[PDB]
Amino acid sequence: AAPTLTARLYSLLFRRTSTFALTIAVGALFFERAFDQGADAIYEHINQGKLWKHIKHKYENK
Amino acid sequence: MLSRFLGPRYRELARNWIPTASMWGAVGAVGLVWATDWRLILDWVPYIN
Amino acid sequence: GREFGHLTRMRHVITYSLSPFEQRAFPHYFTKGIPNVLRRTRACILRVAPPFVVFYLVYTWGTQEFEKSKRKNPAAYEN
Amino acid sequence: TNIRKSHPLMKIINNAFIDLPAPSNISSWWNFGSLLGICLILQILTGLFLAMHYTSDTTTAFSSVTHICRDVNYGWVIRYLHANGASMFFICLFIHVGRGLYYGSYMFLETWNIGVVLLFTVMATAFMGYVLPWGQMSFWGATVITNLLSAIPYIGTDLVEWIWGGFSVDKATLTRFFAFHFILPFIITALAAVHLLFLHETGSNNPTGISSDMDKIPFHPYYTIKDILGALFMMLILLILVLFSPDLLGDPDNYTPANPLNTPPHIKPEWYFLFAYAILRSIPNKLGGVLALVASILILILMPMLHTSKQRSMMFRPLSQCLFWMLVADLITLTWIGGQPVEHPFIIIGQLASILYFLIILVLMPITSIIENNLLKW
Amino acid sequence: ATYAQALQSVPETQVSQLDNGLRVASEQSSQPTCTVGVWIDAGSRYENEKNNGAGYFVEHLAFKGTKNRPGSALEKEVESMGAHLNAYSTREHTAYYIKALSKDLPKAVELLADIVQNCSLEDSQIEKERDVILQELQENDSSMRDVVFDYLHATAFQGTPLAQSVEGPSENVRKLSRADLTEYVSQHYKAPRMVLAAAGGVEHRQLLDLAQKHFSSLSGTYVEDAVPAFTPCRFTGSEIRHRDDALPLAHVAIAVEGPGWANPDNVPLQVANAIIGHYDSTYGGGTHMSSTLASVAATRKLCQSFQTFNICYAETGLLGAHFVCDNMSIDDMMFFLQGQWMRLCTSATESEVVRGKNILRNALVSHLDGTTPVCEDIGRSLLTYGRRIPLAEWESRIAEVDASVVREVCSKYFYDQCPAVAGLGPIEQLPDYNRIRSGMFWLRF
Amino acid sequence: AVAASSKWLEGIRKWYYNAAGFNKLGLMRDDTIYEDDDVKEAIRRLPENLYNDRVFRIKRALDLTMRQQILPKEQWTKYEEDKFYLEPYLKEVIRERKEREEWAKK
Numbered sequence A: 001a002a003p004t005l006t007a008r009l010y011s012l013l014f015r016r017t018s019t020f021a022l023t024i025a026v027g028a029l030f031f032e033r034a035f036d037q038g039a040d041a042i043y044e045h046i047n048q049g050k051l052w053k054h055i056k057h058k059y060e061n062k
Numbered sequence B: 001m002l003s004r005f006l007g008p009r010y011r012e013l014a015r016n017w018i019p020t021a022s023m024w025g026a027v028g029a030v031g032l033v034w035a036t037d038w039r040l041i042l043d044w045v046p047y048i049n
Numbered sequence C: 001g002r003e004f005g006h007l008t009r010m011r012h013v014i015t016y017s018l019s020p021f022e023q024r025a026f027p028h029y030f031t032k033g034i035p036n037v038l039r040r041t042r043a044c045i046l047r048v049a050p051p052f053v054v055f056y057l058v059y060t061w062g063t064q065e066f067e068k069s070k071r072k073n074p075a076a077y078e079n
Numbered sequence D: 001t002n003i004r005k006s007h008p009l010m011k012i013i014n015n016a017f018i019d020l021p022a023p024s025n026i027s028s029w030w031n032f033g034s035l036l037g038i039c040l041i042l043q044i045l046t047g048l049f050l051a052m053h054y055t056s057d058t059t060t061a062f063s064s065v066t067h068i069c070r071d072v073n074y075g076w077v078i079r080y081l082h083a084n085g086a087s088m089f090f091i092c093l094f095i096h097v098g099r100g101l102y103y104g105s106y107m108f109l110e111t112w113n114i115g116v117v118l119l120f121t122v123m124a125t126a127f128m129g130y131v132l133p134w135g136q137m138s139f140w141g142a143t144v145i146t147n148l149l150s151a152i153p154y155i156g157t158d159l160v161e162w163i164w165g166g167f168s169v170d171k172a173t174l175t176r177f178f179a180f181h182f183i184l185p186f187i188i189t190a191l192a193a194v195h196l197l198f199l200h201e202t203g204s205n206n207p208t209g210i211s212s213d214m215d216k217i218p219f220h221p222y223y224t225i226k227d228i229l230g231a232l233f234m235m236l237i238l239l240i241l242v243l244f245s246p247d248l249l250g251d252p253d254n255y256t257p258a259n260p261l262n263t264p265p266h267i268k269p270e271w272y273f274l275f276a277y278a279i280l281r282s283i284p285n286k287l288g289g290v291l292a293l294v295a296s297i298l299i300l301i302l303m304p305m306l307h308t309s310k311q312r313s314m315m316f317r318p319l320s321q322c323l324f325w326m327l328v329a330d331l332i333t334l335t336w337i338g339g340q341p342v343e344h345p346f347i348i349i350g351q352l353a354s355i356l357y358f359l360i361i362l363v364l365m366p367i368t369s370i371i372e373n374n375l376l377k378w
Numbered sequence E: 001a002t003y004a005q006a007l008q009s010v011p012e013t014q015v016s017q018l019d020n021g022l023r024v025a026s027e028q029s030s031q032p033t034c035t036v037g038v039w040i041d042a043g044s045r046y047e048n049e050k051n052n053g054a055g056y057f058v059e060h061l062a063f064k065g066t067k068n069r070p071g072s073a074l075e076k077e078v079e080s081m082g083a084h085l086n087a088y089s090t091r092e093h094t095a096y097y098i099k100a101l102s103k104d105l106p107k108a109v110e111l112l113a114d115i116v117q118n119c120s121l122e123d124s125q126i127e128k129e130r131d132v133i134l135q136e137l138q139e140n141d142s143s144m145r146d147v148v149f150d151y152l153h154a155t156a157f158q159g160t161p162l163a164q165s166v167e168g169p170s171e172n173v174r175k176l177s178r179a180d181l182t183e184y185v186s187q188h189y190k191a192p193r194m195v196l197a198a199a200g201g202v203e204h205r206q207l208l209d210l211a212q213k214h215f216s217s218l219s220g221t222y223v224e225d226a227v228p229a230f231t232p233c234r235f236t237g238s239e240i241r242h243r244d245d246a247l248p249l250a251h252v253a254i255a256v257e258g259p260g261w262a263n264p265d266n267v268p269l270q271v272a273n274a275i276i277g278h279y280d281s282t283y284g285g286g287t288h289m290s291s292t293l294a295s296v297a298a299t300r301k302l303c304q305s306f307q308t309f310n311i312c313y314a315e316t317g318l319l320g321a322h323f324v325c326d327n328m329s330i331d332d333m334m335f336f337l338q339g340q341w342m343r344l345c346t347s348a349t350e351s352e353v354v355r356g357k358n359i360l361r362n363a364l365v366s367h368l369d370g371t372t373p374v375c376e377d378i379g380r381s382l383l384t385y386g387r388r389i390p391l392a393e394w395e396s397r398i399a400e401v402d403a404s405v406v407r408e409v410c411s412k413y414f415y416d417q418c419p420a421v422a423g424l425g426p427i428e429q430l431p432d433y434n435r436i437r438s439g440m441f442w443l444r445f
Numbered sequence F: 001a002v003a004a005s006s007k008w009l010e011g012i013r014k015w016y017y018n019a020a021g022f023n024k025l026g027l028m029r030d031d032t033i034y035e036d037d038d039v040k041e042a043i044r045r046l047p048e049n050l051y052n053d054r055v056f057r058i059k060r061a062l063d064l065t066m067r068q069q070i071l072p073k074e075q076w077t078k079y080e081e082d083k084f085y086l087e088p089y090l091k092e093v094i095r096e097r098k099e100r101e102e103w104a105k106k
Ligand code: HEM
Pocket: D029, D030, D031, D032, D033, D034, D036, D037, D040, D096, D097, D100, D103, D105, D106, D108, D111, D112, D115, D116, D118, D119, D188, D192, D195, D199, D203, D204, D205, D206, D300
């Protein structure tokens, strides 16, 4: 009866609910700068060649 | 006359409670800079720039 | 839970009262009141008043030494 | 079947004002709590008028206030009701705190601690109302706060820039001072209902310091007619200062407009801040001076811990009564020194009186209660 | 002269075995009386749904007449020498035993061998023992403590043999035939499942030769002799609520899953339950007592009684508490009890553990006082541990418990676990299961 | 505990008793104590005749203060007639609190 990989770190960090009181602060990363994969790479792909920083090399260093 | 801290049995008062707080005096250096827009710990790691 | 029937325990005490319409609203006013407000003044005068006397002496020394440090110069005003 | 004992809204009023048990020997010093509730309501129905006709900018603030005394109908009476009504609030607040200090009312711990919060909130509100008319006293009084507020070693330089509207003296300075002044009087009204809910758990203290559960009377009609008479005597004093000398409590130099034009002949706030301005001015360090400003009001929270007498009040303590009136005469000295220029006799006096204010509360009062304990053979 | 020296001078237990597998054990203690009995691995956890009232029906007919001594002739022989007969049945054990004079030992062993081997299950004593058992079930319904512990087993072990009751349902009692009782004895009253124990004025050599004279015709290995299969039983977090407002007081039992018999965690879990304690309203200690839950319930008049238990089976068990209170006090008793469990998972001090170790030492030696509790401890320790654990070995296990051990074992069994709850009576103020389950973890640690 | 100031320090004690004025309201010294939790347990342990005497003396003094009046000088409480009726009951309540506190740390 080998279990699955849901014993994540339950015996390591999550038992004594020390994590739960401060996940607004401590467990808070991986979801602003790791989501450069998110909206900005999607939004500029639907609007390729239409934003200002696409038509930009045409009008500096002239 | 606040000598309730001074006792020979409740010296283990602080030994069951500080293993919670191994990071809890520095969570302001982990968690508040998530919203300060400073660079306090943002030079420590190449994780974030 | 602080209502009138539940406050404290009391035994052997009698009170007598008169109606307000049966008495005069102003009894002895200057016969009793003037000797009463004078011994109340005597009982508290040695506790309240001596601090405010020391404020008066510091105030007079502080405004008079302010002027003769400034432009009041009779005799220290030579070559 | 008595409707004032069974209706859900009427029975709250009955337990609070009508059938409430009250001590029978309560003095006139217990009148000033309902007087503070009259002064707070009056400052709300008069601040309605002023914020209606108002514009807060660096170019028009000084003229927006002069428009009301001449052009706006019934504006001279309502403006000076508001400027003298705030002086009335502060005299009814210092009597109120000195009562509870004298009779040991701070032993009601939760009621006393909400009171210290109420003393901070009205002090910060009135500071952000004297900066609104924009005269010489408004400018130079605000620009000595930020010298000690930028002295905070880490966050202070971005703190003052966030509250100045964004740079310095500009149009939007008086959009954050005015915002912090419209809304702070309503946190006071909610903090006052909580303040009375904690007092209702024990009832009132009395001048003897002894519990009075064998001698209670109803609140109506004995103290409802006594609080109405005391409020009528307060309206007589307030309307005399408005209709016969409306500029007695004030400074003429705040009629000279605000500009960095020239340094003023003096710098002084209103009378109820002169004790606090005298303390910080006698410290030649902009960090030591901002610490002793907050330590002059938050020292009231240590009064339950510093109590060493076996009795509660000061009615039977003659040696402690002498020290209480030395403290009142020490606050009169600081109010006088804080309106004087910084010269030779007013620096040695203004800094020894700053020391004696802390020496009485912390050291002299706990030792004297112990000496009186030994003289009564306990 | 010392408590340590007195544990060395306790007489030891001697164990032997016959050719059929029957074990024989004794402790000699130089007194004119004795207690001898037979302990069997049989019980309601070995029954299925078709014969759940079979072992309790057989205990009733055990003293009603055998082949050699029919009817009341067995009862006349025990009474005429001044001896006593007794029996019981749990979920895993069954015992019959005799208290007699120590010179009546050969007659006592002879009667015991005739009871377990040659008991007549005659068809007229059946159909008149049904009505005695059916009336005894209606008497059991008036005992609120027995009903609420039957509810706790039925909800903690829902679809297993360990959830059944010893007595069995009333429809089984009406229909158990003579054939079902003869199959129960042939399958379960077997010689490697039996222990013959004795304590008092007994010599071990005399009991061994009496066992060869009367018990040697027991079948050693059996027809086809298949291994008795042991299906384990799982624990389920759940609850059962029986609402009856006409009863004057309310009964509540709550437990988590505990360790088995041979688990070494049992000793520090009994030091922990001795710190919580027990209370009753006829106690004289009251508000001064060392247990926090006892001192609170005496000051505020919160309950009539409470107790903590440690029930063990071969592989699992129940670890919890039971209390009785009025309809306005259920929410406060559950709040204070759960706060004492969480205060031992964390925060347990060394001075509490010293008191709880002294309580367990006193309760172990107070049980073994007299020939009947010593003989019962011999008979059920050989079925449970395979040996008798002496008092010197119990003391060396107790002496290695300290405050950090109690914190580790209580956190393993209590912290963030699903309990089983049973409630009976005026229980409208018994809290919701979500609010009970949230009481098994803290905010801080 | 000085034998040379045995009478002198009793003059300052008698002076302070008259400067404080609970004797002008007809009160004893133990009437004026602040009622914390140890004092409230000592009042509950008083015999029934000493409890009823204390309740009336406090009510008569609260009624005098309402009127801003004092008693005639022949009805004032004398210095060498003041009975410390509460002091034996209060020393025992405090000794029991200090026993439960050494036990909780040892
Ligand atoms: C907006 C400010 C305030 C309001 C509206 C207010 C209101 C009241 C009222 C109505 C009472 C009851 C009647 C009375 O005894 O006067 C009271 C009592 C009391 N107040 Fe205030 N108060 C305020 C500020 C303060 C402050 C600043 C303090 C102390 C630092 C304080 C501490 C107390 C205490 C201790 C009592 C009980 C006194 C006693 O019964 O002897 N309050 N307050």
